[PDB]
Design an enzyme around this catalytic site. Structure first.
Site, PDB file in Angstrom:
ATOM      1  N   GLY A   1       0.825  -1.197   0.000  1.00 35.92           N
ATOM      2  CA  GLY A   1       0.000   0.000   0.000  1.00 35.92           C
ATOM      3  C   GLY A   1       0.858   1.245   0.000  1.00 35.92           C
ATOM      4  O   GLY A   1       2.092   1.183  -0.011  1.00 35.92           O
TER       5      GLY A   1
ATOM      6  N   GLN B   1       5.841   4.422  -0.336  1.00 37.91           N
ATOM      7  CA  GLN B   1       5.107   3.163  -0.364  1.00 37.91           C
ATOM      8  C   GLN B   1       5.654   2.161   0.654  1.00 37.91           C
ATOM      9  O   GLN B   1       6.826   2.195   1.043  1.00 37.91           O
ATOM     10  CB  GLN B   1       5.110   2.534  -1.766  1.00 37.91           C
ATOM     11  CG  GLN B   1       4.130   3.154  -2.735  1.00 37.91           C
ATOM     12  CD  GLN B   1       4.692   4.263  -3.579  1.00 37.91           C
ATOM     13  OE1 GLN B   1       5.866   4.615  -3.472  1.00 37.91           O
ATOM     14  NE2 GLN B   1       3.848   4.834  -4.436  1.00 37.91           N
TER      15      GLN B   1
ATOM     16  N   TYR C   1       4.789  -6.732  10.810  1.00 38.55           N
ATOM     17  CA  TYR C   1       3.708  -6.925   9.845  1.00 38.55           C
ATOM     18  C   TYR C   1       2.457  -7.434  10.562  1.00 38.55           C
ATOM     19  O   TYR C   1       2.525  -8.363  11.376  1.00 38.55           O
ATOM     20  CB  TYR C   1       4.116  -7.885   8.719  1.00 38.55           C
ATOM     21  CG  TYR C   1       3.017  -8.182   7.703  1.00 38.55           C
ATOM     22  CD1 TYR C   1       2.565  -7.214   6.817  1.00 38.55           C
ATOM     23  CD2 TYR C   1       2.466  -9.448   7.609  1.00 38.55           C
ATOM     24  CE1 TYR C   1       1.567  -7.498   5.883  1.00 38.55           C
ATOM     25  CE2 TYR C   1       1.472  -9.741   6.681  1.00 38.55           C
ATOM     26  CZ  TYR C   1       1.027  -8.768   5.821  1.00 38.55           C
ATOM     27  OH  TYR C   1       0.041  -9.073   4.906  1.00 38.55           O
TER      28      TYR C   1
ATOM     29  N   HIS D   1      -4.129  -7.790   8.805  1.00 38.04           N
ATOM     30  CA  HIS D   1      -5.103  -7.042   8.029  1.00 38.04           C
ATOM     31  C   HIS D   1      -5.001  -5.552   8.316  1.00 38.04           C
ATOM     32  O   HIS D   1      -4.395  -5.116   9.300  1.00 38.04           O
ATOM     33  CB  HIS D   1      -6.516  -7.534   8.349  1.00 38.04           C
ATOM     34  CG  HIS D   1      -6.762  -8.953   7.949  1.00 38.04           C
ATOM     35  ND1 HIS D   1      -7.450  -9.285   6.803  1.00 38.04           N
ATOM     36  CD2 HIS D   1      -6.358 -10.125   8.498  1.00 38.04           C
ATOM     37  CE1 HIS D   1      -7.506 -10.601   6.689  1.00 38.04           C
ATOM     38  NE2 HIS D   1      -6.845 -11.135   7.702  1.00 38.04           N
TER      39      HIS D   1
ATOM     40  N   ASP E   1      -2.228  11.826  10.840  1.00 33.65           N
ATOM     41  CA  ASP E   1      -2.853  11.071   9.758  1.00 33.65           C
ATOM     42  C   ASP E   1      -3.573   9.823  10.276  1.00 33.65           C
ATOM     43  O   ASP E   1      -3.155   8.693  10.019  1.00 33.65           O
ATOM     44  CB  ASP E   1      -1.818  10.683   8.688  1.00 33.65           C
ATOM     45  CG  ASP E   1      -2.450  10.454   7.333  1.00 33.65           C
ATOM     46  OD1 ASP E   1      -3.558  10.988   7.106  1.00 33.65           O
ATOM     47  OD2 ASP E   1      -1.844   9.742   6.498  1.00 33.65           O
TER      48      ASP E   1
HETATM   49  C1  LIG Z   1       4.003   2.738   8.994  1.00 36.84           C
HETATM   50  N1  LIG Z   1       3.830   1.290   9.023  1.00 36.84           N
HETATM   51  C2  LIG Z   1       2.863   0.562   8.415  1.00 36.84           C
HETATM   52  C3  LIG Z   1       3.134  -0.751   8.710  1.00 36.84           C
HETATM   53  N2  LIG Z   1       2.416  -1.904   8.354  1.00 36.84           N
HETATM   54  C4  LIG Z   1       2.662  -3.118   8.930  1.00 36.84           C
HETATM   55  N3  LIG Z   1       1.832  -4.028   8.503  1.00 36.84           N
HETATM   56  C5  LIG Z   1       1.000  -3.382   7.600  1.00 36.84           C
HETATM   57  C6  LIG Z   1      -0.072  -3.822   6.808  1.00 36.84           C
HETATM   58  N4  LIG Z   1      -0.504  -5.091   6.864  1.00 36.84           N
HETATM   59  C7  LIG Z   1      -1.851  -5.482   6.500  1.00 36.84           C
HETATM   60  C8  LIG Z   1      -1.909  -5.692   5.025  1.00 36.84           C
HETATM   61  N5  LIG Z   1      -2.684  -4.954   4.204  1.00 36.84           N
HETATM   62  C9  LIG Z   1      -2.468  -5.400   2.914  1.00 36.84           C
HETATM   63  C10 LIG Z   1      -2.983  -5.030   1.669  1.00 36.84           C
HETATM   64  C11 LIG Z   1      -2.517  -5.715   0.559  1.00 36.84           C
HETATM   65 CL1  LIG Z   1      -3.139  -5.280  -0.999  1.00 36.84          CL
HETATM   66  C12 LIG Z   1      -1.563  -6.742   0.683  1.00 36.84           C
HETATM   67 CL2  LIG Z   1      -1.000  -7.579  -0.725  1.00 36.84          CL
HETATM   68  C13 LIG Z   1      -1.057  -7.095   1.915  1.00 36.84           C
HETATM   69  C14 LIG Z   1      -1.516  -6.419   3.045  1.00 36.84           C
HETATM   70  N6  LIG Z   1      -1.178  -6.578   4.388  1.00 36.84           N
HETATM   71  N7  LIG Z   1      -0.714  -2.925   6.019  1.00 36.84           N
HETATM   72  C15 LIG Z   1      -0.291  -1.638   5.969  1.00 36.84           C
HETATM   73  N8  LIG Z   1      -0.953  -0.757   5.197  1.00 36.84           N
HETATM   74  C16 LIG Z   1      -0.090  -0.288   4.122  1.00 36.84           C
HETATM   75  C17 LIG Z   1      -0.843   0.718   3.304  1.00 36.84           C
HETATM   76  O1  LIG Z   1      -2.062   0.192   2.783  1.00 36.84           O
HETATM   77  C18 LIG Z   1      -2.877  -0.334   3.828  1.00 36.84           C
HETATM   78  C19 LIG Z   1      -2.157  -1.364   4.646  1.00 36.84           C
HETATM   79  N9  LIG Z   1       0.727  -1.167   6.719  1.00 36.84           N
HETATM   80  C20 LIG Z   1       1.338  -2.063   7.509  1.00 36.84           C
HETATM   81  C21 LIG Z   1       4.238  -0.731   9.561  1.00 36.84           C
HETATM   82  N10 LIG Z   1       4.689   0.503   9.744  1.00 36.84           N
END
Ligand SMILES: Cn1cc(-n2cnc3c(NCc4nc5cc(Cl)c(Cl)cc5[nH]4)nc(N4CCOCC4)nc32)cn1
EC number: 2.7.11.22
Lengths: 826, 248, 332
Positions: free
Chosen positions: C22, C28, C103, C106, C147
């Site tokens: 994301g 990114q 990580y 969701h 944010d």
């Molecule tokens: C500043 N910061 C962020 C993180 N961080 C850690 N874990 C995730 C995580 N994990 C769920 C997750 N959402 C997913 C969406 C897709 Cl499409 C795929 Cl393929 C795999 C995914 N996994 N999601 C996100 N967001 C990134 C931006 O878009 C929304 C999710 N940030 C995350 C750590 N530090």
């Protein structure tokens, strides 16, 4: 940006609702049938129905009801669309000119509200004082039917009872009264409220709340002779009016869930009921008149009449004919006879109206070798399940192959001059400890049969507890002949094994053509299945031979042939298998960054993956390395129903919200991230639920090549039976057709005054976006039907700046020629 | 979790600079010169006292992991101040720090910055961040000098004299390796202790526990007089070597 | 201190990059697996290639703020790694750095935007309690997460909720005022004061955004959706009441109060339009979506609320996920 064109090849056939009244004239008896986005108006005759008019609306018809306010000669029509477009419609005929007038229009959507579980409900008062709408939990919306409310403005009354199952305006009350069955933690209850237009709130209702069956489904408004209400459940039927309480719990209805209700005698003496196995019942209200002159209800009796199609709506036309409106099978006209036939049935079919029903899978194949192309569909549900052979020839010619069981996925094996079809049938736990099927069906009526003897999952020492009467799905692979459509063989899969995926292909250096099935071991306790098989079959000399099985730890939802190797999705995993010289499957590479890898499609070494919530992902095999690699993904979250690859850069998807989109590579490789972000460049509200995308065309071909302005052909099937087609355009043709649309929308009068641009806007509960990259071919093709002056109004000032030349002015007969060329693609 | 940033005086005999042949006297002069350069430049740029101190602490830590011969002093100082500005939200453009450096440094001294001063500084940032192990948050004696003084109650003028004299001692201790030996809380107490002896004030009288002769124990637990005396001796040594008399 | 205290000496070679998940605050976000441990991590890339200010000051803030914060509802920065570094060629080294995070399974944007998940009242309690406990932690340390969006609230399948992207976050001082940007939150979740131009704002900016989310979890639709700042102000006014001196004394002092006006001075209808929400939550929503930031509740006050006061972290409740309805919408 991308440019694409979408047209309807077959209109929606499933019946969503049906009403009877006096709409076209105060004298005629009319039957208004609602299919998705389509209204069909019929006039009842002694032989059947006479069609008189059909209109399209720019919306899914959610509520359709006929009423006649004081001062009108004939019934008016209320319709509410699924996007909350509301309107009141009047029929007007000037000799040969038939028109539907929009009396009133409005959008009743609330800024804040929770959509209800049991969906939009719309009811009208017996005195036609108001329209009731149940759109959101905790709220009851009232549109008062005053002469001045042409804007159809409305107000909300707070409703304490948040979870409402069903509601009807009650009969015989001193004021507008609603009776509704609602659910709280203590069970279900039926309660009443009075509606006051003057105070704009509920007052204490006429009769007290009673505790009712937990599976209470529908509320029936009994007409004034009896007054009160009947509550239909799974095991019990109850009449509640004031202090009177009557309850019948006949043993016949417990067998199958009742889904429809309809009134035969206006007196309310007789009602029709229908269940999910097609049975049609009669609910008889016995009448007891007291010497006071007043009529009380003696008892309730339910009598079995016969078998109909599994029906969404039943509506009785006079003189003993009933229209069976079905979503899962063919709709019908039936005769209710006073005397039973020799089999004991009082129901005899008059006519059968084709319903492509739920199209769960389809394949395009030219069976007759005409070069044309025919569409074979897995269509229908349960007893109404069938295969349909559809060919262009000006109407579509459709052959029906009854299977009498649910069809799941189809694929064509030319080497064997036959089809492979996955199917499931319902059996009920019987007193032997095994199961018994209700009706014989394709899997049981096969010429030769086999059953899997696999020992893979025999590790559980004790079976899961089974109680008598519980439904189970039994899954089969059907081998069906391409000329006779005889079920040549049926293979039955393991107990609790679901067949989810089917392919016909050769693998590796193995010259044999195989049927390969992917399965999942489904146990009610498991949230997501944790066992499954890939099974390789060979159909040879009338017998299906098990060639090899590979155990997998999940559900094999989709499988696709990939450059001689097998590409499979097992739960979150996407895996590639090689076929060894020992005729066994061997794992090469895996990819795991998915939630539920529900849909796979390929082109070359590129793979498109459809996920439950993560939209679409592009994978590559990377042959030197031997591992998958993520190329690019669509980062806007969507819930997918089907995907397809249009070309090496454009990808097509279908959302569960009845929306279509196209993703493309950003084509500007400035940064690696731009390449990795798939861009949603096409957005379009289709209005139908697409299950299967399939490359091909049914158009008859006689070396006709490159005359078309359109490039490509993708066919798609939907739940409502609608078959559509997506094709690509050049920038020049798109802008011509896009600019022409804006003109046709200003010219063409919409039923209910629904803005076309609103209708096609991308729409989820959370988002609404304007449509982009898509030409509504159904709008363009209506140019050939609008009157000549309207045509000239549309072609006026229209200049086509195609490029490689300066803006050239358009002529009407030239544009009529373009559309006529476009109508040849379907 | 978090790195350790404190050594023992004996360990300074084995800094990388010492082991390349630099003698103890020279290394300390190099530190005084580099710290004061970081101090003088930032004061010209108008920087907050915490920003100056943070740069100086990075500098002192840096030359616990690197040799002065291998990395030029003044360049390192500029890089420390440049990063300190970003850490403490008092940012400056590198060109402005370079500009101010030529004003305060002579021709030989600004020669270290080479043909391109900015790149030589900006290149070192990576090595600075890695050397400080990205531990950017730094606490300084100032905040404790004030936190502890606020809890003193008595003659407004005598306490203010104590604070200012102690504050000066804090500024002077930045020229030394004390920042590497003792936590800032101890430094703040030590400078209060030193100021008191010089002003002949008995601080316990201003505390909530006026008969607790070891007044600092309510501010900083587990600090022996041994440590406070060691720190005081090191501070006044700077004054005696230069021969300036105590601020008083 | 021996290991796990030395940051930035490790290479991204120890991580195999699965792909990109994301878009975050300033770059990114990617997903990776540690070769040694097998752990799934999340990476944000910091590039030093622009020498105008060398290491990004914004990145430096995300590193300073996050390493100070340790909480069960605040995402942990595991480590910082670098690209292959040249030996003895450190002057020519153009290598960029990567920030390593934990990580989570969701993200609330994906779950809700699809519509698959369903939040029960008790689930919403498990969500709101955990979110505010983290926000209170950060607000107590006098930091402002500017944010708050559904993409920065991440949940594990356990039911644990954590906050994520602190790259748009800055320190808050009540005594000393530094002007900050009037446009800092996603318009759908923006506090009214920042719409009216408040350059020095309260930590109540975050409480408003989480209040909008509290409604969204009950309505299943964001409360205020508009494409333009004035239109959003109109939508907020229709529900929360038009900004007025009576409800907000210092609305007159804000830069755009006379410039930006709603169509009419609407009355507050929040309780009427949210009648379906439980009483305990509705009071929380009313206090959280209060126009005047001086009267908007604090994060602590939300935790000492009838809705959240008695919630038990023991009963963490994961949002509900459908099963065979995912493959097929039930025909029955
Ligand atoms: C500043 N910061 C962020 C993180 N961080 C850690 N874990 C995730 C995580 N994990 C769920 C997750 N959402 C997913 C969406 C897709 Cl499409 C795929 Cl393929 C795999 C995914 N996994 N999601 C996100 N967001 C990134 C931006 O878009 C929304 C999710 N940030 C995350 C750590 N530090």
């Amino acid at each position: 940006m991308s440019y694409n064109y979408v047209v309807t090849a077959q209109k929606p056939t499933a019946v969503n609702g049906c009403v009877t009244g006096h709409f076209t004239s105060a004298e005629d008896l009319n039957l208004l049938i609602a299919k998705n986005t389509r209204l069909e108006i019929y006039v009842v005759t002694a032989e059947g129905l006479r069609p008189v008019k059909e209109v399209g609306m720019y919306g899914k018809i959610a509520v359709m009801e006929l009423f006649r306010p004081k001062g009108e000669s004939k019934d008016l029509l209320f319709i509410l669309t699924a996007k909350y477009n509301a309107c009141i419609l009047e029929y007007k005929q000037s000799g040969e000119s038939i028109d539907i007038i929009t009396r009133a229009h409005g959008n009743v959507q609330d800024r804040i509200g929770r959509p209800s579980e049991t969906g939009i409900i719309g009811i009208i008062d017996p005195e036609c004082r108001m329209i009731g709408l149940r759109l959101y939990d905790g709220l009851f919306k009232v549109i008062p039917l005053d002469r001045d409310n042409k804007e159809l403005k409305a107000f909300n009354i707070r409703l304490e009872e948040l979870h409402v199952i069903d509601v009807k305006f009650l009969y015989g009350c001193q004021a507008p009264t609603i009776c509704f069955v609602y659910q709280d933690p203590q069970g279900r209850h039926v309660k009443t409220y009075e509606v006051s237009l003057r105070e704009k709130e509920f007052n204490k209702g006429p009769w007290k709340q009673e505790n009712v069956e937990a599976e209470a489904s529908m509320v029936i408004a009994v007409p004034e002779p009896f007054g009160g209400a009947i509550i239909i459940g799974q095991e019990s039927i109850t009449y509640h009016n004031g202090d009177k309480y009557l309850a019948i719990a006949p043993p016949i209805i417990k067998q199958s869930t009742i889904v429809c209700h309809n009134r035969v005698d206006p007196n309310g003496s007789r009602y029709l009921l229908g269940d999910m196995e097609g049975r049609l019942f009669m609910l008889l209200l016995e009448k007891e008149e007291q010497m006071d002159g007043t009529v009380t209800l003696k008892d309730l009796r339910v009598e079995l009449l016969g078998e109909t199609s599994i029906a969404e709506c039943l509506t009785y036309l006079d003189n003993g004919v009933v229209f069976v409106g079905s979503r899962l099978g063919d709709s019908q006209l039936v005769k209710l006879n006073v005397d039973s036939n020799e089999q004991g049935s009082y129901v005899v079919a008059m006519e059968t109206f084709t319903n492509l029903g739920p199209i769960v899978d389809m394949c395009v194949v030219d069976l007759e070798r005409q070069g044309q192309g025919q569409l074979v569909t897995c269509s229908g549900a349960f007893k109404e399940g069938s295969l349909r052979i559809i060919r262009n020839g000006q109407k579509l010619h459709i052959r029906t192959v009854p299977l009498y069981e649910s069809p799941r996925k189809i694929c064509y094996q030319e080497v064997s001059q036959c089809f492979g079809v996955l199917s499931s049938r319902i059996e009920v736990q019987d007193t032997s400890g095994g199961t018994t099927a209700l009706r014989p069906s394709a899997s049981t009526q096969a010429l030769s049969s086999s059953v899997s003897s696999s020992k893979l999952f025999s590790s559980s020492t004790a079976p899961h507890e089974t109680s008598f009467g519980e439904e189970v799905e039994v899954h089969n692979l059907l081998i069906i002949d391409q000329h006779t459509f005889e079920v040549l063989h049926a293979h039955q899969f393991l107990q609790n094994e679901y067949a989810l995926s089917l392919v016909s292909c050769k693998l590796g250096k193995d010259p044999n053509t195989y049927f390969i099935v992917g399965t999942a071991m489904v146990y009610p306790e498991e949230a997501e299945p944790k066992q499954g098989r890939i099974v390789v079959f060979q159909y040879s000399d009338g017998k299906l031979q098990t060639v090899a099985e590979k155990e997998v730890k999940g559900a094999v939802y989709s499988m696709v042939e990939f450059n001689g190797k097998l590409l499979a999705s097992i739960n979150s995993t996407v895996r590639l298998y090689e076929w060894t010289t020992e005729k066994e499957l061997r794992t090469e590479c895996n990819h795991y960054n998915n939630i539920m890898a529900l849909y796979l499609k390929t082109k070359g070494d590129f793979i498109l993956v459809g996920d439950l919530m993560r939209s679409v992902l592009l994978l590559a095999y990377k042959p030197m390395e031997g591992n998958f690699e993520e190329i690019a993904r669509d980062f806007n979250p969507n819930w997918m129903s089907a995907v397809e690859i249009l070309d090496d850069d454009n990808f097509l998807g279908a959302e569960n919200a009845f929306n279509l989109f196209v993703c493309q590579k950003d084509s500007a490789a400035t940064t690696d991230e731009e390449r990795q972000h798939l861009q949603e460049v096409g957005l379009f509200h289709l209005g139908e639920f697409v299950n299967v995308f399939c490359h091909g065309s049914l158009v008859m071909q006689n070396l006709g090549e490159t005359s078309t302005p359109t490039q490509g052909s993708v066919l798609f099937g939907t739940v409502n039976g609608m078959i559509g087609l997506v094709t690509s355009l050049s920038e020049s043709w798109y802008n011509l057709l896009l600019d022409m649309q804006n003109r046709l929308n200003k010219v063409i009068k919409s039923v209910g005054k629904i803005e076309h641009s609103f209708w096609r806007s991308f729409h989820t509960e959370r988002k609404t976006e304007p449509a982009t990259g898509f030409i509504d071919g159904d709008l363009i093709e209506s140019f050939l039907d609008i009157s000549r002056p309207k045509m000239q109004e549309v072609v006026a000032n229209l200049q086509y700046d195609d490029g490689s030349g300066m803006k050239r002015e358009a002529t009407a007969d030239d544009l009529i020629k373009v559309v006529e060329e476009l109508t040849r693609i379907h | 979790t978090k790195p350790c940033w404190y050594w023992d005086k004996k360990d300074l005999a084995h800094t990388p600079s010492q082991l390349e042949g630099l003698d103890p006297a020279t290394e300390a002069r190099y530190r005084r010169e580099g710290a004061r350069f970081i101090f003088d430049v930032g004061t010209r740029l108008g920087l907050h006292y915490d920003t100056l101190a943070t740069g100086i602490i990075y500098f002192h830590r840096f030359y616990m992991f690197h040799s002065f011969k291998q990395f030029p002093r003044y360049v390192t100082g500029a890089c420390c101040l440049f990063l300190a500005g970003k850490v403490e939200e008092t940012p400056k453009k590198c060109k402005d720090i370079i500009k101010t450096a030529r004003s305060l440094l002579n021709d030989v001294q600004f020669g270290q910055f080479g043909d391109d001063p900015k790149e030589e500084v900006m290149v070192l940032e990576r090595i600075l961040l890695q050397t400080i192990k990205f531990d950017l948050q730094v606490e300084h004696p100032y905040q404790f000098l004030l936190k502890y003084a606020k809890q003193l109650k008595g003659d407004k003028n005598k306490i203010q004299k104590l604070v200012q004299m102690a504050w000066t001692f804090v500024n002077d201790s930045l020229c030394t390796t004390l920042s590497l030996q003792w936590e800032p809380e101890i430094i703040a107490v030590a400078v209060m202790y030193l100021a008191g002896r010089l002003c002949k004030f008995e601080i316990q009288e201003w505390t909530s526990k006026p008969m607790y002769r070891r007044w600092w124990e309510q501010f900083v637990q587990d600090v022996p007089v041994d440590v406070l005396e060691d720190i005081c001796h090191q501070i006044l040594d700077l004054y005696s070597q230069g021969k300036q008399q105590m601020p008083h | 201190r021996q290991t796990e205290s030395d940051w930035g000496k490790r290479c991204v070679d120890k991580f195999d990059i699965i792909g990109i998940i994301g878009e975050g605050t300033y770059g990114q976000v990617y997903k990776a697996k540690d070769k040694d441990t097998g752990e799934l991590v999340a990476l944000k890339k910091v590039r030093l290639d622009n020498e105008k200010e060398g290491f990004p000051i914004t990145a430096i803030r995300e590193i300073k703020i996050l390493r100070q914060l340790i909480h069960r509802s605040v995402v942990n920065m595991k480590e910082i790694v670098t690209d292959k570094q040249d030996a003895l060629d450190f002057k020519k080294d153009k290598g960029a750095f990567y920030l390593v995070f934990e990580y989570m399974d969701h993200d609330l944007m994906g779950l809700l935007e699809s519509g698959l998940v369903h939040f029960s009242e008790d689930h919403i309690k498990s969500f709101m309690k955990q979110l505010m406990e983290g926000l209170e932690y950060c607000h107590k340390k006098n930091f402002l997460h500017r944010d708050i969006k559904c993409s920065n609230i991440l949940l594990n399948n356990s039911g644990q909720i954590k906050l994520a992207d602190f790259g748009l976050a800055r320190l808050y001082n009540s005594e000393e005022s530094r002007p900050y940007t009037n446009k800092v939150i996603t318009l759908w979740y923006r506090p009214p004061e920042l719409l009216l131009g408040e350059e020095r704002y309260t930590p109540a900016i975050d409480v408003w955004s989480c209040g909008c989310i509290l409604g969204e979890l009950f309505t299943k639709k964001p409360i205020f959706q508009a494409n333009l700042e004035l239109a959003q102000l109109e939508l907020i006014s229709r529900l929360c009441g038009s900004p007025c001196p009576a409800v907000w004394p210092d609305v007159i002092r804000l830069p755009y109060f006379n410039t930006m006006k709603p169509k009419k001075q609407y009355r507050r209808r929040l309780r009427e339009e949210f009648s379906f929400i439980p009483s305990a939550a509705l009071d929380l929503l009313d206090h959280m979506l209060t126009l005047d930031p001086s009267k908007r509740c604090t994060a602590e006050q939300t935790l000492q609320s009838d809705f959240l006061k008695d919630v038990e972290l023991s009963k963490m409740a994961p949002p509900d996920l459908p099963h065979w309805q995912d493959c097929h919408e039930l025909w029955s």
